[PDB]
Amino acid sequence: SVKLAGNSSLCPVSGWAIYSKDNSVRIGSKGDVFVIREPFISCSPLECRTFFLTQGALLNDKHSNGTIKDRSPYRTLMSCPIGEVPSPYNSRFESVAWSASACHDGINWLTIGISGPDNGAVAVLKYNGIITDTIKSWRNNILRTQESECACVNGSCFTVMTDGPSNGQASYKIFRIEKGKIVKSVEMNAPNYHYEECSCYPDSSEITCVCRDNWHGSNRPWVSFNQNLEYQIGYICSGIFGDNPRPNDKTGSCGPVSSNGANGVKGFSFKYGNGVWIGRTKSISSRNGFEMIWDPNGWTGTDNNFSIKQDIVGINEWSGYSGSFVQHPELTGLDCIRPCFWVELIRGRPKENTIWTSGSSISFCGVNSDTVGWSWPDGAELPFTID
Amino acid sequence: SVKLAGNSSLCPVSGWAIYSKDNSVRIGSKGDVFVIREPFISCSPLECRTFFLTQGALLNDKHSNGTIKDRSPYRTLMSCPIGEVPSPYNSRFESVAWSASACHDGINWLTIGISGPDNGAVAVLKYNGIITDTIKSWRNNILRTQESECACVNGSCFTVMTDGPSNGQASYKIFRIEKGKIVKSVEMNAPNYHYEECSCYPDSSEITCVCRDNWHGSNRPWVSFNQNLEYQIGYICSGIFGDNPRPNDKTGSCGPVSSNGANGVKGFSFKYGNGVWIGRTKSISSRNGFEMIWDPNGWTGTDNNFSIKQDIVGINEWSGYSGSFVQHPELTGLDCIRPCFWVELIRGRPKENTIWTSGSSISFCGVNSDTVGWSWPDGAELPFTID
Amino acid sequence: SVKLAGNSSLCPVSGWAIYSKDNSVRIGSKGDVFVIREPFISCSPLECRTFFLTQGALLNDKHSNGTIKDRSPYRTLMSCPIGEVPSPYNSRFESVAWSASACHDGINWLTIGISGPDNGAVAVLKYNGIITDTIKSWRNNILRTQESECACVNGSCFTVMTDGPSNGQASYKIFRIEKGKIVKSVEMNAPNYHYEECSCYPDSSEITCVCRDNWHGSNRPWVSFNQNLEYQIGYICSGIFGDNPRPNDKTGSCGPVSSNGANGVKGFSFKYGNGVWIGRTKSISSRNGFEMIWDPNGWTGTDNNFSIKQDIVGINEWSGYSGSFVQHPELTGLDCIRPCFWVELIRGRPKENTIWTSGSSISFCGVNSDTVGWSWPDGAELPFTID
Amino acid sequence: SVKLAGNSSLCPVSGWAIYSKDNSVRIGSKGDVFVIREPFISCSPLECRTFFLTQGALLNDKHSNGTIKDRSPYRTLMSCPIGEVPSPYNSRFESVAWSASACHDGINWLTIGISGPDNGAVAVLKYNGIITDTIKSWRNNILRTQESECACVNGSCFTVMTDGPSNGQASYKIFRIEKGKIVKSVEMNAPNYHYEECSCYPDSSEITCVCRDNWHGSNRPWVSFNQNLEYQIGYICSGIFGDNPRPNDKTGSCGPVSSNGANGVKGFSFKYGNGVWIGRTKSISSRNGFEMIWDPNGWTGTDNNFSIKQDIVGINEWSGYSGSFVQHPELTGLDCIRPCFWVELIRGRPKENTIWTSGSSISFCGVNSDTVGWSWPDGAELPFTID
Ligand SMILES: *[C@@H]1O[C@H](CO)[C@@H](O[C@@H]2O[C@H](CO)[C@@H](O[C@@H]3O[C@H](CO)[C@@H](O)[C@H](O)[C@@H]3O)[C@H](O)[C@H]2NC(C)=O)[C@H](O)[C@H]1NC(C)=O
Ligand SMILES: *[C@@H]1O[C@H](CO)[C@@H](O[C@@H]2O[C@H](CO)[C@@H](O[C@@H]3O[C@H](CO)[C@@H](O)[C@H](O)[C@@H]3O)[C@H](O)[C@H]2NC(C)=O)[C@H](O)[C@H]1NC(C)=O
Ligand SMILES: CC(=O)N[C@H]1[C@H]([C@H](O)[C@H](O)CO)OC(C(=O)O)=C[C@@H]1NC(=N)N
Ligand SMILES: CC(=O)N[C@H]1[C@H]([C@H](O)[C@H](O)CO)OC(C(=O)O)=C[C@@H]1NC(=N)N
Ligand SMILES: CC(=O)N[C@H]1[C@H]([C@H](O)[C@H](O)CO)OC(C(=O)O)=C[C@@H]1NC(=N)N
Ligand SMILES: CC(=O)N[C@H]1[C@H]([C@H](O)[C@H](O)CO)OC(C(=O)O)=C[C@@H]1NC(=N)N
Ligand SMILES: *[C@@H]1O[C@H](CO)[C@@H](O)[C@H](O)[C@H]1NC(C)=O
Ligand SMILES: *[C@@H]1O[C@H](CO)[C@@H](O)[C@H](O)[C@H]1NC(C)=O
Ligand SMILES: *[C@@H]1O[C@H](CO)[C@@H](O)[C@H](O)[C@H]1NC(C)=O
Ligand SMILES: *[C@@H]1O[C@H](CO)[C@@H](O)[C@H](O)[C@H]1NC(C)=O
Ligand SMILES: *[C@@H]1O[C@H](CO)[C@@H](O)[C@H](O)[C@H]1NC(C)=O
Ligand SMILES: *[C@@H]1O[C@H](CO)[C@@H](O)[C@H](O)[C@H]1NC(C)=O
Ligand SMILES: [Ca+2]
Ligand SMILES: [Ca+2]
Ligand SMILES: [Ca+2]
Ligand SMILES: [Ca+2]
Ligand SMILES: [Ca+2]
Ligand SMILES: [Ca+2]
Ligand SMILES: [Ca+2]
Ligand SMILES: [Ca+2]
Ligand SMILES: [Ca+2]
């Protein structure tokens, strides 16, 4: 076992090849499948796993009732091999949590699971399944984290946490974690910024995060930092807005775009110089459809022109959260860090007439060979027998 | 593989971070989950597992009928990874048993499973799944043991067993077991004491057990011994009574507290000098709620003052059995033995209108970083379809 | 990996300690559990497994209909860890078979699975799951084998097969198998003998088999042989008759006891000099109850006196097939071969008003420490929802 | 780990011994079993696995509705150990796909999964679960591949793909793949030929494929090539026609037999000099029955005489697809490549009155010891509760 170097650059990619699809909701109609949301993928040098927050209940059972609710004592972080349905029969228990992150440093798994009351939540850190540290809410207002994989470089793993209002200025901290122990942290000086649910990845020994502004930005905020946590901040400038909801594409801003800026959804983007691969919903007002857009100057440029668009989920189909995950050379045998991404396909409340809310997932990995756009939707027929 | 040293002291702890929650009853509403009770956790140098006594039946099936009953030929000791639901599809078979204990010496698993008739029960000992010894009832009155993990020190594992009345003077024996073979035992000379379901842990090469007096003590009895089985006995002196049922907190006794002393529940406590971490129900009359209390002089002092209280399960929620389990430095990489504990959340009979009785579990580990009190209850909605 | 020596003697035993119980039928009321019969246990140097013949169907499903039937194209030999329920989710596939045997030589598993038509059945031999040999019916009349573990000595494994009438003189062959290849066989010269479903075990480099006479013997025939297949034959002389059905205990015979000699049940016995450990039903006319009897001169003596009787299953409870299995020193660390045995608990047709027939199992291992008699029955409530 | 040599000849075989049967449909009546079709078997140096295309749904659930449909975004390639039912609880995820192939080179698994739209499908290649290459439709008309195992020789694996009409001239390409990377391909110059769903195996360092002519051939086309992709093409000359549908046996042709030549079914054959082992349905008009025929001059001879016929599935029972798979000396310890084959037993639409279509499987391996013909059908009772 050797720790991930994380010192190579991102592999340039021309398109996205489908990597997995679990059909969780379709199968859960009869099978014993967890009610879940906020799934995400993360890989070790040996395997890739799907992490997810259960509602401590199964699909098509009465306990799935009211699962639109975000936080409860019953939610747990669990994981299974990528592409398999999240079942009590194939899932490893990770932590008790209604907000989470996880990543492998090359030696062991780090998991971060947040539970407890809204006014005093505690993040429990585990390394190889052993509790190694905790961090408690510092603003007493829903301590929350990535809902996707943390990022590791040379034995150090990094994550971002938020505490404070979801509709106004909050507090954002970056953490450096070694073998499950917080060895350093810093609060970001980001007046008028809002950071939630960051999708972070390593690139040339540094970390880049693309996050969610739930306050007043329809474009996505970003934060990048080195291992010493010296950071820079900004927003993606492209007029191809990345959040949901958002306005129709137009002239963008390198600051928060106020138009339709309230609320949002977890998302991601990959930076390549001045260019950016943007993953986003197809709808500007709802969580449906998904597409990947290559914008050669979208990181720093404000125009709404782009070069490549690839369909992932049809506009008439439900989508939801999305996030980045990477495959290190230690896993692939490549000389660069390969970008992949996952999409949560949310079914149920509030948009559908069920008693429950749950999601399935799909994932893709970046390649330079031929690819094709299509739609790989959830595919479940609602409502269910339970409703 | 190397045997556990067990020669370091207990890690001082300021609070308890949640470690696991299986949501067994909620999931068993639809999923294939064993009807169980008397669960407990125990760890090896590699993993932690949940042990439990099945009723040889599944939740929401007719064979769960009458499972309030304590003993039968159908009950079996099984185990699964911690935090996972006890299912026939993820559970390892250990032993046929209606009373049990288990622990890992660093090399292999030792399991103790008691089955047979009330008037002649036999404990079957296994080492790495192979029968290595037996011990038969010596008072012909329900031979019974810990219902939690045994304690191991330098290749020797220790447990306590009881035989005799549950409402009067009984007989109590301590055993030293090496590779599944009983190498020494001694009967405790404890007139007017009553010991049942001891929660035992190693500390500085010696064993400390906190147990249940079902006869006439509302405080908990304890027994401590070295590897040669030279022992000391007493009761926790604190006026913060630990058993259930019990009186309201008042002036305690270093002997058995007669007030509300009959009946009881399995519990635990961690000794730190004259101080004690007490886990107990919140109700004085019923098995509901759970809290952790730090009493700096509660081991030897009789007053009812304390310094710290941390909520674990709300008073309006069902609890049940609780027990200690430790994580050795061989597992954690620490220089001390870490204290953890589990709580059984009992649902069904006799307090609820069902045909069945079963439990789920939660567990916590002691830390010196920030923690928070809350309520992590079972969360199941009774009755079930079967009733 | 090293091949089993099999050159030590049987461990003398004073009683039997319960080893496993799967509660298969009770659990199958709701869980996904195979309809099975003819289960048996066999161990490697690492683990013990339960082998069984499925009916290619699950309990409480319409396809369990008519499963009283012995042979069909759907029956398969599968296995799971001992004590676990036989489910499609935890069972390894072994072979297509309606008659079978299996054993581990210390290096790999040997399985023998017989399928095909009654008039031309073929035994398929597999070593490490690879087909290594076949043997076809030589009398064109239901080629059939042990339904329990074969026996291995120094890299050679041995089994017995029968072909011919179930109600008259048939043909019996012994096989020597090395790495899945038949290297030698011999037909037993046994006029007026009848051998079926032998329970064979190694002892001091030679093999002893105790079998079933379905023709005209209420006592059990035996055959013993060395590695060169030089054999001896006879019947257990004890007036404590071992087959079912049988007469009340009286003066026995060293030849086939004709009284109630037709029909029978698979069983076993362990020989110790002139003495014998006899496992048998409690009923003389039906497959219910089970007991272990130590008869110090029962191998060669015809009287009906005995020294020890241990209850296993109550007379008012269903039993069925039973068989021997051993644990070699390579597994136990002992200096002798330990005797164990399993009992099939048959539920359903023909004695019960269901559409199906299936069994669960219990097992015990011989010890010299204290033991106790009891009843560990199937425990299922029939009929089921399907009937 | 060492790569397969693939340089030995096929093991001559006189008959076929049954190897596996999963009883998937029977078990799926109650159990949680995937709706599948197009199953196939492939082995590594360690184990054999069943690959299959799920419909992203379970048997006896509403989402099995309309599963007669060949292609959708929900279909996925998964695998489980041979002989086990394809369940979400025991199946490994491989790829998103409605057409697939897979094989092991001795070091790692190669999987090929085709998904996307009919007019622009993309094959995603994975090596050890990591995406290594893609190939996109070149005729924009349903890119499709083997639906059985690819063939590996000295670290290179080979497959055949088709793109174009199913009822006329199409385009056929052979690929050489090393560690999941396409290193060479060539389009076959085969005017008036039609190739689909090739069953390919290695023999003496070269590859032989027997395929399906869906255009105008009731006999099967073949293509053979060396590692440099230098190929030869033709049709099986035997008057014992191998496709379905087909004419009654008569005088054959070394070119496509036009009579009943339209439509077809995936099949296989093993070449031995001028002779051929032919696997085929028993019915000339429908997918029922299965038999193995040895025709000593059937590869190059046009007569309808043969030497051996072995029954596999009765004519009154449903069959379906069939394919070859081999076991290399690296797995068996033999000095030749052993031929095996599997048969898909299709149940449901369009021939049966259900809402769904699914298959189970059986498999056989070639031996030179005694064998027997019989019928090992699916055995499920339709319709099901869902219909
Ligand atoms: C679990 O066990 C309980 C108690 O045995 C079952 O409830 C009982 O159901 C039986 C059968 O329906 C009832 O027995 C009948 O009693 C009536 C008189 O009320 C008598 O006339 C009949 O001859 C028969 O004996 C019984 O009343 C009833 N007991 C109670 C307390 O309700 C229950 O059905 C079982 N549940 C499952 C899921 O198996
Ligand atoms: C699987 O799919 C089939 C076909 O869609 C389902 O059968 C169909 O069920 C629907 C809903 O009940 C029926 O639609 C209705 O048709 C009537 C006219 O007959 C119309 O007045 C209603 O407005 C409605 O459209 C439809 O008749 C029926 N089709 C057939 C061929 O029976 C079936 O229910 C599905 N099965 C499962 C388990 O989901
Ligand atoms: C901690 C927590 O509750 N986080 C939220 C989250 C949150 O409400 C917003 O980002 C605003 O702050 O949004 C949503 C969402 O679907 O928008 C899911 C989350 N649910 C879970 N993580 N359980
Ligand atoms: C062997 C046995 O039956 N032990 C008991 C136990 C016992 O009744 C008391 O401690 C009094 O002696 O109490 C209880 C109880 O929930 O209070 C559960 C146990 N159930 C099981 N261990 N199966
Ligand atoms: C090959 C086969 O059918 N063997 C039989 C067996 C047999 O009928 C007798 O011993 C008489 O020959 O008896 C019985 C039995 O329950 O008595 C179960 C078996 N069923 C299975 N092995 N499948
Ligand atoms: C890609 C695809 O759809 N291939 C087909 C296939 C095809 O229609 C013919 O060979 C004609 O081209 O036939 C059949 C069939 O059962 O005949 C099943 C396949 N289904 C799946 N592979 N999913
Ligand atoms: C990246 O890290 C690896 C492992 O330490 C090292 O060998 C290599 O020199 C580094 N690459 C660069 C470009 O610095
Ligand atoms: C869901 O919760 C509501 C309480 O708001 C309750 O009324 C309803 O019965 C529940 N539904 C189910 C199916 O349990
Ligand atoms: C505890 O045991 C270890 C291992 O034998 C030994 O090295 C060490 O000295 C002991 N620790 C103390 C504090 O005595
Ligand atoms: C039994 O076999 C073992 C392993 O070969 C050998 O060492 C030993 O000498 C044998 N024991 C006897 C009593 O022959
Ligand atoms: C069982 O088989 C019989 C045929 O003998 C049939 O009549 C009956 O319907 C079947 N029962 C079930 C539940 O399928
Ligand atoms: C086949 O390959 C093996 C491994 O490279 C080689 O040793 C052997 O010579 C080859 N066999 C033949 C018959 O050429
Ligand atoms: Ca079920
Ligand atoms: Ca926003
Ligand atoms: Ca642009
Ligand atoms: Ca008490
Ligand atoms: Ca005090
Ligand atoms: Ca008889
Ligand atoms: Ca006698
Ligand atoms: Ca054709
Ligand atoms: Ca011919």
DSSP string, A143-175: -B--SSB-EEETTEEEEEEEES-SSS--EEEEE
Largest CA distance in chain B: 53
Distance CA(C304)–CA(C309), nearest Å, equals 13
Token readout for B24 is 């067994």
Residues in chain D: 387
Using left for φ > 0, alpha for ψ between -120 and 50, and beta otherwise, residue A197 falls in left
Nearest to C76 by CA among C91, C60, C59, C61: C91
Query: Which atom of ligand 4 approaches the CA of B265 most closely?
Result: 17
Chain A CB contacts of B377 under 8 Å are 73
Nearest to A147 by CA among A293, A20, A42: A42
Distance CA(B259)–CA(B265), nearest Å, equals 15
Whether a cis peptide bond, with omega within 30° of 0, leads into B350 is yes
SS3 D27: helix
Q: Which ligand is nearest to the CA of D205?
A: 12
Residue B280 · residue B242 · CB < 8 Å: yes
SS3 A62: helix
Distance CA(C343)–CA(C23), nearest Å, equals 12
Task: For ligand 5, pick from C40, C70, C148, C195 the residue to mutate: most ligand atoms within 8 Å of CB.
Answer: C70
Residue C159 · residue C153 · CB < 8 Å: no
Helix and strand counts by DSSP (H, E) for chain B: 2, 24
DSSP conformation class of C252? -
Q: How far is the centre of ligand 7, averaged over its atoms, from the C-alpha of B159 (Å)?
A: 53
DSSP conformation class of B144? B
Name every residue whose Cβ is closer than 8 Å to that of residue D69 and which is 6 or more positions away in sequence.
none
SS3 D308: strand
Residues closing a segment before a gap in chain D (C–N exceeding 2.5 Å): none
Q: Are strands D130-136 and D122-127 parallel, antiparallel or unpaired?
A: antiparallel
Q: Angle at CA C364, nearest 5°, toward C362 and C368?
A: 165
Residue of C nearest to B130 (CA): C332
Token readout for B30 is 């639809």
C-beta atoms of D58 and A27 within 8 A: yes
Residue of A nearest to B29 (CA): A61
Which 14-43 residues of chain B touch chain A by CB within 8 A? 17-23, 26-27, 29-33
Token readout for D356 is 């769904």
* Helix, strand, coil percentages in chain D from 3-state DSSP, rounded to 5: 5, 45, 50
Distance CA(B201)–CA(B209), nearest Å, equals 7
Phi/psi at B250 (5° precision):
-160, -150
Distance CA(D125)–CA(D132), nearest Å, equals 6
Distance CA(C362)–CA(C376), nearest Å, equals 8
Token readout for A370 is 């031929």
Q: How far is CA B154 from CA A212, B208, C194, in A?
A: 53, 16, 56
Which value, in Å, is the radius of gyration of the alpha carbons in chain B? Answer: 19
Name every residue whose Cβ is closer than 8 Å to that of residue C189 and which is 6 or more positions away in sequence.
none
Which residues of D are known binding-site members?
32, 37, 71, 196-197, 212-213, 217, 243, 261, 263, 287, 295, 297, 303, 305
Distance CA(D104)–CA(D120), nearest Å, equals 28
CATH code of the domain covering residue B82: 2.120.10.10
Query: Measuring from atom 3 of ligand 9, which residue has the nearest CA?
Result: B5
Q: Are strands B99-104 and A48-58 parallel, antiparallel or unpaired?
A: unpaired
SS3 A102: strand
Say if residue C71 carries a ligand binding annotation. yes
Nearest to C143 by CA among C169, C122, C158: C122
Q: How far is CA A82 from CA A69, B51, B181, D96, D296, in A?
A: 26, 28, 44, 12, 48
Token readout for A89 is 């029969």
Phi/psi at B36 (5° precision):
-140, 165
Question: What was the resolution (in A) of this experimentally determined structure?
Answer: 1.9
Q: Which residues does residue C208 pair with via DSSP β-bridges, in sequence order?
A: C201, C224
Query: Residues of D with catalytic annotation?
Result: 70, 321
Distance CA(C386)–CA(B52), nearest Å, equals 31
Distance CA(D115)–CA(D125), nearest Å, equals 11
Element (H, E) at A6: none
Residue C131 · residue D365 · CB < 8 Å: yes
Task: For ligand 6, pick from D74, D139, D144, D346 the residue to mutate: most ligand atoms within 8 Å of CB.
Answer: D144
Query: Which atom of ligand 5 approaches the CA of C144 most closely?
Result: 1
Q: How far is the centre of ligand 12, averaged over its atoms, from the C-alpha of D109 (Å)?
A: 23
SS3 D244: coil
Largest CA distance in chain C: 53
SS3 A110: strand
Query: Which atom of ligand 11 approaches the CA of C65 most closely?
Result: 1
Query: Measuring from atom 2 of ligand 7, which residue has the nearest CA?
Result: A5
* Helix, strand, coil percentages in chain A from 3-state DSSP, rounded to 5: 5, 45, 50
Distance CA(A92)–CA(B50), nearest Å, equals 13
Q: How far is CA C234 from CA B13, C209, C210, C217, in A?
A: 71, 11, 10, 12
Distance CA(B126)–CA(B113), nearest Å, equals 8
Residue A279 · residue A322 · CB < 8 Å: yes
C-beta atoms of A130 and B327 within 8 A: yes
Residue C172 · residue C188 · CB < 8 Å: yes
Distance CA(B326)–CA(B339), nearest Å, equals 5
SS3 C158: strand
Chain D CB contacts of C32 under 8 Å are 27, 30-32
Q: How far is CA A66 from CA A135, B249, B256, in A?
A: 29, 39, 48
Q: How far is the centre of ligand 15, averaged over its atoms, from the C-alpha of D134 (Å)?
A: 28
Nearest to D202 by CA among D95, D43, D368: D43
Distance CA(A241)–CA(D286), nearest Å, equals 56
Touching subunits for chain B (3+ Cβ pairs under 8 A): A, C
Chain A CB contacts of B329 under 8 Å are none
Distance CA(D318)–CA(C231), nearest Å, equals 48
Residue A171 · residue A137 · CB < 8 Å: no
Half-sphere exposure of C9 (CA within 13 A, CB side): 6
Token readout for B206 is 């010696």
Which structural domain, as residue segments, surrounds residue D23? 1-387
Q: Which residues does residue C199 pair with via DSSP β-bridges, in sequence order?
A: C210
Query: Residues of A with catalytic annotation?
Result: 70, 321
* Overall domain count for chain D: 1
Name every residue whose Cβ is closer than 8 Å to that of residue A118 and which is 6 or more positions away in sequence.
A71, A141, A142
Question: For the stretch B211-242, what's the b/e string if a residue is b when 16 or more beta carbons lie within 10 angstroms of its beta carbon?
Answer: bbbbbbbbbbbbbbbebebebebebbbbbbbb
Q: Please name the member of D83, D89, D374 whose beta carbon is closest to the beta carbon of C93.
A: D83
Q: Which residues does residue A223 pair with via DSSP β-bridges, in sequence order?
A: A209, A233
C-alpha dihedral sign at B87, B88, B90, B91: positive
Distance CA(C330)–CA(C5), nearest Å, equals 8
Distance CA(C355)–CA(D35), nearest Å, equals 27
| Amino acid identity at A266 | K
